Amino acid sequence: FGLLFVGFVAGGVAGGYFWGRSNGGGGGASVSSTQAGFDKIGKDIQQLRNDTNAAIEGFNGRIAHDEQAIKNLAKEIEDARAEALVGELGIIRSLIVANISMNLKESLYELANQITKRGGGIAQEAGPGCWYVDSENCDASCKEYIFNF
Amino acid sequence: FGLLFVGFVAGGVAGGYFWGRSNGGGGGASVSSTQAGFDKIGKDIQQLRNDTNAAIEGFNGRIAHDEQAIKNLAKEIEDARAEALVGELGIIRSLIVANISMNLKESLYELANQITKRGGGIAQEAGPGCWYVDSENCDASCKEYIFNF
Amino acid sequence: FGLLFVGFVAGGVAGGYFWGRSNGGGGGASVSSTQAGFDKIGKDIQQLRNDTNAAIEGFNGRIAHDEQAIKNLAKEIEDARAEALVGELGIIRSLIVANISMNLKESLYELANQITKRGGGIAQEAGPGCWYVDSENCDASCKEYIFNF
Amino acid sequence: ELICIVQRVNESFSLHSGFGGNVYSMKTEPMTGFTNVTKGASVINQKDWIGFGDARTDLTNDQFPASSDVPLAVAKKFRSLSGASLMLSAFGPPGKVDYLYQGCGKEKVFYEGVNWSPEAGIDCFGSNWTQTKKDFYSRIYEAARSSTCMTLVNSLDTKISSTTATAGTASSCSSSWMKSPLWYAESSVNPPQVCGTEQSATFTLPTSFGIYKCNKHVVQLCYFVYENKAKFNTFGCGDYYQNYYDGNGNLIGGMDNRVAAYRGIANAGVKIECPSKILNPGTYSIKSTPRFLLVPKRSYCFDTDGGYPIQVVQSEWSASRRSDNATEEACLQTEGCIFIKKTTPYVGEAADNAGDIEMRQLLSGLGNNDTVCVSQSGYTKGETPFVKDYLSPPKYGRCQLKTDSGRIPTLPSGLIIPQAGTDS
Amino acid sequence: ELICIVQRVNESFSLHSGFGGNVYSMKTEPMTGFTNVTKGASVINQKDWIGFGDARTDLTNDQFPASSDVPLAVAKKFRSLSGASLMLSAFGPPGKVDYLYQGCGKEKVFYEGVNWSPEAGIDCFGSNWTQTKKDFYSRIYEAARSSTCMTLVNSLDTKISSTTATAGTASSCSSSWMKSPLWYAESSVNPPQVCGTEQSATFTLPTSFGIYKCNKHVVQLCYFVYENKAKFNTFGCGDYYQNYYDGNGNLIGGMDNRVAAYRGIANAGVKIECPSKILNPGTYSIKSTPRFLLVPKRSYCFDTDGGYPIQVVQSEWSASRRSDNATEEACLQTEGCIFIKKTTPYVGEAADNAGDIEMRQLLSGLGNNDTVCVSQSGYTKGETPFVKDYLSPPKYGRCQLKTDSGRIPTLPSGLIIPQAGTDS
Amino acid sequence: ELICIVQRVNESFSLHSGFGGNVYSMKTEPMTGFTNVTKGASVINQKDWIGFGDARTDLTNDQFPASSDVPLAVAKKFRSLSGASLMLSAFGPPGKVDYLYQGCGKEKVFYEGVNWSPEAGIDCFGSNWTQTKKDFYSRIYEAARSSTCMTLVNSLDTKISSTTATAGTASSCSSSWMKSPLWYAESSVNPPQVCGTEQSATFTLPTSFGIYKCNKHVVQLCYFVYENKAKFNTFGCGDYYQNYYDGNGNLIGGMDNRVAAYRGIANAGVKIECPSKILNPGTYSIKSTPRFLLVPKRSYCFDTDGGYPIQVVQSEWSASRRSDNATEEACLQTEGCIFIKKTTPYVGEAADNAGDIEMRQLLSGLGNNDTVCVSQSGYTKGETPFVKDYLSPPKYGRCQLKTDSGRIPTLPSGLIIPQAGTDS
Ligand SMILES: CC(=O)N[C@H]1[C@H]([C@H](O)[C@H](O)COC(C)=O)O[C@@](O[C@@H]2[C@@H](O)[C@H](O)O[C@H](CO)[C@@H]2O)(C(=O)O)C[C@@H]1O
Ligand SMILES: CC(=O)N[C@H]1[C@H]([C@H](O)[C@H](O)COC(C)=O)O[C@@](O[C@@H]2[C@@H](O)[C@H](O)O[C@H](CO)[C@@H]2O)(C(=O)O)C[C@@H]1O
Ligand SMILES: CC(=O)N[C@H]1[C@H]([C@H](O)[C@H](O)COC(C)=O)O[C@@](O[C@@H]2[C@@H](O)[C@H](O)O[C@H](CO)[C@@H]2O)(C(=O)O)C[C@@H]1O
Ligand SMILES: *[C@@H]1O[C@H](CO)[C@@H](O[C@@H]2O[C@H](CO)[C@@H](O)[C@H](O)[C@H]2NC(C)=O)[C@H](O)[C@H]1NC(C)=O
Ligand SMILES: *[C@@H]1O[C@H](CO)[C@@H](O[C@@H]2O[C@H](CO)[C@@H](O)[C@H](O)[C@H]2NC(C)=O)[C@H](O)[C@H]1NC(C)=O
Ligand SMILES: *[C@@H]1O[C@H](CO)[C@@H](O[C@@H]2O[C@H](CO)[C@@H](O)[C@H](O)[C@H]2NC(C)=O)[C@H](O)[C@H]1NC(C)=O
Ligand SMILES: *[C@@H]1O[C@H](CO)[C@@H](O[C@@H]2O[C@H](CO)[C@@H](O)[C@H](O)[C@H]2NC(C)=O)[C@H](O)[C@H]1NC(C)=O
Ligand SMILES: *[C@@H]1O[C@H](CO)[C@@H](O[C@@H]2O[C@H](CO)[C@@H](O)[C@H](O)[C@H]2NC(C)=O)[C@H](O)[C@H]1NC(C)=O
Ligand SMILES: *[C@@H]1O[C@H](CO)[C@@H](O[C@@H]2O[C@H](CO)[C@@H](O)[C@H](O)[C@H]2NC(C)=O)[C@H](O)[C@H]1NC(C)=O
Ligand SMILES: *[C@@H]1O[C@H](CO)[C@@H](O)[C@H](O)[C@H]1NC(C)=O
Ligand SMILES: *[C@@H]1O[C@H](CO)[C@@H](O)[C@H](O)[C@H]1NC(C)=O
Ligand SMILES: *[C@@H]1O[C@H](CO)[C@@H](O)[C@H](O)[C@H]1NC(C)=O
């Protein structure tokens, strides 16, 4: 339905990114492909995931100095310190997940933008990841050129 | 002026989300309605607000273990610990407010996107929440169909 | 290439924001100006930078109470506390840099949006910061009117 | 025609900043708040605490549960006997109940003491039992604070050197004597011709007692108090002395009048003082004047495996009887001790002195399963990290912090409009 | 025709990462920095501090303000008298000024001591007053560190047993004697036929003095020092002894030559030593050789309600006079004590010894309203949480931390371009 | 025709929340993990640590490196001599090796002690050297814990009062005697006609020794143990006594039988006990029975400039010899002491008792450059802030915290789809 929405599918049916088309005869009746050659997305995903190492290394590198002469574990204090560290880690996590989401979404916008400028101005944008093509201007091999499926 | 901007109004004049229209005779002279049936926005607001509970419960659930045998309050230490906790709470606050803002803005984009695909490709997007309709293609009952006011 | 992308240039060649144009004779052969009158961007940059003071003052205002009767510096403890504070400062930094980025990007969208509504609907948006103008509808003084270069 | 969704705010809208987007709203709601604080006693861990008490927590009392300040389930966690007190068991005065208090628990509740108050009327040459009481419970609370367990040691190994000396008896002590200290007297010392021989004794503090490890002992190093040496020479030759030594010969207690001034009260007569001291396990020596010898015969055994700050419950009679506040003042001057105090008099349901509505309210927390913090201000649940007023120390657990309500940040509510960029 | 805004960066642009968007820029600016540190004395709370001093902080001095190292408003916060010192008031030597120092303040400034230096030339059989000085101020600083208030106790309740003993006088002490300790002598003890009787005395440390609660007392347990027993037998029979006992008989001070070796300096003659000890309130006993008895007659009363680390200001004369650094070394070896020291000599405006430009600079902070941290390195305001170099302990307040300037993160400035997504 | 990129997820996709955007993914990966813990000894700072040992860390041993439990580079950091031990050097028994241990290091490794075990068969009237051993190392470890440096002081300044007394010799001590304590006897005291005169002595603990500052001294205040006074009167008149006093006369050690009970073992004969005490620098006095005088002649000098918790390495023989675990139990009862223990017997490569494979594994960490934490559980590198199980104290450095693996948050991996807004 176009890059602003994520939909669910039951049973089998692969998840991911697919090409979708709508009308024709009036009224038409849907259609969704079985995924194109979006190797850009796969490559971007790879880069974004590897980029998380920076934030993780920052956390791993930080360990508080301590000195205990006591002979019996102070279990409650030990656990409190861990709980606080886990709390910090949870915030960093929420920051990282959002940082992935926003940068992937942007990378997807950047994919759709290349498509728009490929068939320009044949494309006609209808919100991110959606286009209106007048099946008069464009045959089937032109749409094949513009959307590459 | 279209979803990228927020404007101010004086005296009375209700705040919120409204329908706005521009030209006609050359040169035209503005017009802003008195809010449509954006119950989607009201519902989304409700969901987004309730979704903040997760972050709040995370904070409330975290309380540092302590043990004091001392008989007189260490007021300055007590206050310092509170100040640090309030600091953390302030960062979480700033994260939550932004998380609401971004997800509401996106929900608004998702509202505008449905409108675009309702009168397609009659709509013609002019940035988020704005459209160009040629008052030739569309009567008044078509615009009534597309924008629902 | 339009507001979703940042490109590199070698040797000399000023960096920043410029006007770019594409085809004409089929096939055309590029062209990039030498920056217009985007004083809005310069002004927005100024405002966004000054808006960071709030987050910085919040950090500067927070200093933990301490009391040491000891006569010799506890260097390792001293350094650990600093390291933890620097860690916090690093997270705030990453939040601020992103807050600048997102709000500048939005301010740029708001600049492009004004251009769209200036030549409406002559503009025809092709993703943020990009437009398709049919050099039939628009002379050179109209494009001069719409894009102001 | 250009058709746009338009966003507008009023003077009623205020801007809330975010990292990655701002929000306009008319209403705000606080993000979190204060956790209530309940006065009284409680525990953070129901599986590791122990109570020591008297009739008011004794499930075997004939008038249970009318005579109880706690319900059955809480009473099962107490080691209590009607008529008993730690102090009563420490000395074992004639005719008083003599309960062997013992138990383990990192959290400890002491609800006992009233059974040896001024109302008891115990004499036994006592200079001031209220003073002795305060001093005794001070030592108990200090030792209990760093111990996991506690047990009465009802009989120390003792040995006296004299073969002629015999057990002491006094008209002021029911024509008998304490269980501890033991009293040994030489009948032949008469200030005519006879001065007798200096008396000697040893007592041992064990390294253990039953299943309980002993690292520390609370004992009384008693001595007799005379007002002057002239008054003492009515019984013994030379000045009075009763000195306590460890294994090596280091003086650790007692009263020696060869060097210290007499401080007996005017015409009061002979008095006994019994300061409590915390001593390590080992064998200890005693040197005394020929006629009178006092030897410690009991102790309270503690470990040093650690414990939480303790809770001490006010132990007083109903208005009709004569009480003291010795355990209160013992608690107040002792680190790591939390005192629980009634604001109204003790009015019992069973009889006058057992089964009080207020105390039941204050002790009700001992049966809760959701207490995370215990303090001198009361106890809390784990709702929020904040309280309106300080939780006064001593305290332990997940304890809330005081902050002003104004420093608690808010979140936007009601009609909401997002904002980003400079919009100019 | 396709018309686009195009974003481009140079080699001069560097990428700054963010959580939710990156930024290209050519320039950076540090996000924050270091807070200056000012040498000298100051306070974090103008409403809860107290100063103790001499002429240099005495607003009633005839030459004020020329004779003062602090302005009027700061002088009002001091308890000072020209010619006075804590030590002078402790002993009360003949002809010296005898000020009753007393006050309350969680933060404490001691700017006094110079008025009993070697320049004073006080003899009174003193073995080494500089040593006594260092020892005295050590006890004061330790006790003051954990106390809210301090007061001289100008007269202890005392009682001697002897009826023949009389007040002591010495040619070396202006043909008189100290106020404390008191000196009692038996004229009849002559090593011919007479040995006399062992002398006895008691002194009481009160639980309070005026409005001031006493939990601890600094007192001197003085004794005479002879070089050998032969040298002592010129005055008394047997060895010298002067012993101090608490209520029970535990030896707590003094010099007993029945067991300890003599340490009198060769042919120096009789000397007096006066070590200071911190003692609880109560009644104390004294046993001494028949001819000479020393009894403490004054103390300094402290509470245990707590206080901040104290500040001690260098108290020395101008170059022309003979000074010591006893209060410096007392401070250095005492936990929770912060010493303030000049780098140039003392040159006064009034006369030689009062009104110094450097000291006025160093003490100027005592009048500031914005000091948040006080340390051995100096004091700071609440600008940033960081300092370039460590703030040396002792210290208290909102104290800055040392970090390298390179670890302070930067923010983008100048021409700025946003970046998001992979852009490939 | 409308053509759209469509985003869809399966039941296999789960939603991960973010501040500013959510993520759908099928797989997750933990964000971080646990750091391994290695058993044995190590150091966090290779430039500030010191080892004290015997043959097993002595690079000058004829059989090096076969006789060594550490490689050359680590051995250079040890102060060791074959046959030596701290305790051997403390007393200096006849014919034993007498190494002057001295060094500085904030981190300290004690790998020594086995050379005076029961196998040594040293008598010298020793009541129980294993007990003396445990007591000695306890004092060492306590003092070392707060000191930067340590040095043997191989000779204290001493002076005895007697002119007739002569040096002591015993058939049980190789017809000789210890270096410390020194033994002085009066030949003329015979319980016929002669009782002799009470013996006196002084010993001085210096404020420094060579380049080493002394704030604290570990010394033995020895005394002889008889089983009863009748058994003692075979040698001396009256009861036995050997008392130790500081400069003022305060009893600080020894055995006085005028007040303390005898505790000599039945028919064991004369025994010597040598408890170790931590004493300040100064001059100390001794009073003893006429015939026998014991005087401390050595010490271990420590500062109070501070140090890290120490590491003590198990020092036992191979199975064929008689060992003890005194240094283990000394370490266990001493704050700030970390004990390193083998799980298999000691089997040496050089001979039976030197060069063990397991110990080499356990001591291998002493040569690492990347250890950040040292604990009773072992040592770690700075991989993550977490460990699977607690690091048991004592410990110091950048030490990891225990958390459950389930509380470690995850990150999305594999095929990923972004989500924002309500999508409804
Ligand atoms: C063990 C013993 O001495 N018992 C007798 C006691 C006791 O000796 C005296 O109290 C001594 O007091 C002390 C402890 O110093 O005296 C008894 O008789 C006393 C009598 O001595 C006293 O003159 O008058 C009392 C009467 O009021 C009393 O009868 C006693 O105290 O009961 C007899 C004990 O057998
Ligand atoms: C109280 C008292 O004894 N006063 C006389 C003192 C004093 O007795 C001696 O110092 C004893 O010293 C002590 C404290 O042990 O002596 C006085 O005369 C002395 C004299 O004894 C000494 O031989 O010579 C001195 C002259 O240099 C001096 O005059 C004194 O010290 O003034 C007289 C005191 O009355
Ligand atoms: C210094 C000294 O006294 N040396 C002689 C010792 C010593 O006196 C006794 O042990 C006293 O013991 C103590 C320390 O109290 O005795 C020596 O001979 C002993 C002898 O006294 C004892 O009766 O029998 C022993 C034989 O088993 C032994 O020979 C000694 O111990 O060697 C001689 C010392 O010269
Ligand atoms: C939902 O969709 C996902 C991806 O479209 C499916 O994941 C694939 O599963 C097969 C077999 O388990 C793997 O070999 C593939 O590698 C997976 N996809 C990818 C991209 O790695 C998943 O099986 C689907 N689930 C259901 C229930 O249909
Ligand atoms: C600004 O606009 C807001 C909303 O448009 C107004 O809020 C309404 O106020 C009335 C009366 O106070 C309430 O009954 C409504 O419920 C409010 N709106 C909503 C959506 O709840 C506000 O009164 C306006 N302020 C001014 C000064 O005109
Ligand atoms: C890259 O571009 C930037 C900006 O386009 C150049 O920065 C300018 O440098 C000159 C001389 O150093 C300054 O006077 C200008 O003020 C800078 N620009 C701005 C906007 O302030 C930079 O020199 C370029 N670098 C290269 C290597 O060409
Ligand atoms: C993120 O940046 C924005 C924009 O610079 C900040 O928004 C400003 O917020 C203040 C209130 O704190 C307002 O007075 C300004 O008008 C806002 N500026 C704009 C352009 O709207 C925002 O504060 C920053 N976020 C945080 C958490 O500091
Ligand atoms: C958020 O994610 C982005 C994108 O993955 C990260 O941007 C990378 O930042 C590093 C520098 O730290 C650059 O070398 C990479 O080229 C950047 N990647 C892209 C695609 O631009 C960014 O670091 C993350 N934010 C944080 C705070 O870690
Ligand atoms: C930011 O806000 C979003 C939207 O309100 C939150 O997303 C919700 O996350 C929960 C899981 O925690 C899901 O069950 C909801 O369905 C999500 N809502 C929507 C509309 O997608 C998100 O949790 C918030 N971020 C953080 C870190 O709390
Ligand atoms: C992936 O991250 C690691 C950090 O651990 C970095 O060293 C590596 O260069 C990164 N790879 C890419 C392709 O960015
Ligand atoms: C609202 O949040 C609460 C968390 O307190 C949750 O239990 C509830 O299910 C949420 N409601 C909706 C409709 O999401
Ligand atoms: C810039 O920030 C400062 C905060 O230090 C503020 O006082 C000032 O008003 C701001 N200026 C503008 C134009 O917003």
Residue numbers in the entry:
A (entry chain B), B (entry chain B), C (entry chain B): 9 to 157
D (entry chain A), E (entry chain A), F (entry chain A): 3 to 193, 197 to 429
Article passage:
ICV, however, has only one major surface glycoprotein, the hemagglutinin-esterase-fusion (HEF) protein, which possesses all-in-one of receptor binding, receptor destroying and membrane fusion activities. To further evaluate the infectivity and transmissibility of IDV, we expressed and purified the ectodomain of D/OK HEF, and determined that it also uses 9-O-Acetyl-Sia as its receptor by glycan microarray. We also solved the crystal structure of D/OK HEF, both in its native state (resolution of 2.4 Å) and in complex with its receptor analogue (resolution of 3.1 Å), and the structure of the enzymatically inactive HEF (resolution of 2.4 Å) alone and in complex with two receptor analogs respectively (both resolutions of 2.2 Å).
To avoid the enzymatic cleavage of the receptor substrates, we generated the catalytic mutant for the binding experiments and for the structures of the relevant complexes. For the IDV HEF-mut/receptor complex structures, interpretable electron density is observed for all the three glycan rings of 9-O-Ac-3'SleC, including Neu5,9Ac2 (9-O-Ac-Sia-1), galactose-2 (Gal-2), and N-acetylglucosamine-3 (GlcNAc-3); while for 9-O-Ac-3'SLN, electron density for the first two sugars is well defined. But the majority of the interactions between ligands and IDV HEF are made by the 9-O-Ac-Sia-1 moiety, whereas the glycan portion of the ligands do not make significant contacts with IDV HEF, except for a hydrogen bond between the Gal-2 of 9-O-Ac-3'SLN and S173. The acetyl carbonyl oxygen forms a hydrogen bond with the hydroxyl group of Y231 (ICV HEF: Y227). The 5-N-acetyl group of the ligand fits into a hydrophobic pocket formed mainly by W185, and forms a hydrogen-bonding interaction with A172. In addition, the carboxyl group of C1 formed two hydrogen-bonding interactions with S173.
